[PDB]
Amino acid sequence: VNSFSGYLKLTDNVYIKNADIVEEAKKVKPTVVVNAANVYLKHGGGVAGALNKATNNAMQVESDDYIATNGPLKVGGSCVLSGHNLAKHCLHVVGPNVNKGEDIQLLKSAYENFNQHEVLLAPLLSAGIFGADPIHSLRVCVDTVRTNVYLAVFDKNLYDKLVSSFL
Ligand SMILES: Cc1sc2ncnc(Sc3ccccc3C(=O)O)c2c1C
Incomplete structure (x- = not known):
C-alpha cells in the first residue's frame, strides 16, 4: 500500500x-x-x-x-539528486529531444533508468517540448518499466487520448 490516490491502473x-x-x-x-x-x-x-x-x-x-x-549527462541517461521540498530524491532522466534531432530509440534506454527505483512519480518522457508523441512514450514506458510507476499528466485532454487509445 502506498499513498498514491486516484490513479487508473494500466498494467x-x-x-x-x-x-x-x-x-x-x-x-x-x-x-x-x-x-x-x-x-x-x-x-x-x-x-x-x-x-x-x-x-x-x-x-x-x-x-x-x-x-x-x-x-553533462548522456541522452538516455540519468542522475539522482535531491528532491528538495518535492520528494526525497529527484531522478533526472534525459529522454531524446525530437526538436533537437535525437533518436527516439533512446527513449527505451531513458525509461530503463526507472527500473533502479521500486516506486516513482513521473511524467511521460520525451513528450511535450521534447517533441515525441505522448502515446508512443506511454507504450515504451509500459513495455520497459517493471517497477511501480505513477504517471502524472497535467492536461486533462491529453490524459483522455492516452486512456482511450491504450492497448
Ligand atoms: C506545470 C506542469 S505540472 C506537469 N506535470 C506533467 N507534465 C507536464 S507537461 C507534459 C510533459 C510530458 C508529457 C505530457 C505533458 C502534459 O502536457 O501534460 C506538467 C506541467 C507543464
Whole structure:
C-alpha cells in the first residue's frame, strides 16, 4: 500500500492520473520524482522548469554544481539528486529531444533508468517540448518499466487520448 490516490491502473505496474506532477509531489512527497531533464540539467521549461520553480531554484543551484563536477549527462541517461521540498530524491532522466534531432530509440534506454527505483512519480518522457508523441512514450514506458510507476499528466485532454487509445 502506498499513498498514491486516484490513479487508473494500466498494467500490473503502470498507473496514470490527470494531475500536476508538482502538486502530486508536494502532496505525496514520494521517494522519487522523475524530472524530464536535458543533458545540461538546465531546467528552463516544461516539467523541469515547473519542478525547479517549485524548489525556488534550489534544484538549479544543485544541478549546476553537479555539472561543474561531472560534466553533462548522456541522452538516455540519468542522475539522482535531491528532491528538495518535492520528494526525497529527484531522478533526472534525459529522454531524446525530437526538436533537437535525437533518436527516439533512446527513449527505451531513458525509461530503463526507472527500473533502479521500486516506486516513482513521473511524467511521460520525451513528450511535450521534447517533441515525441505522448502515446508512443506511454507504450515504451509500459513495455520497459517493471517497477511501480505513477504517471502524472497535467492536461486533462491529453490524459483522455492516452486512456482511450491504450492497448
Ligand atoms: C506545470 C506542469 S505540472 C506537469 N506535470 C506533467 N507534465 C507536464 S507537461 C507534459 C510533459 C510530458 C508529457 C505530457 C505533458 C502534459 O502536457 O501534460 C506538467 C506541467 C507543464
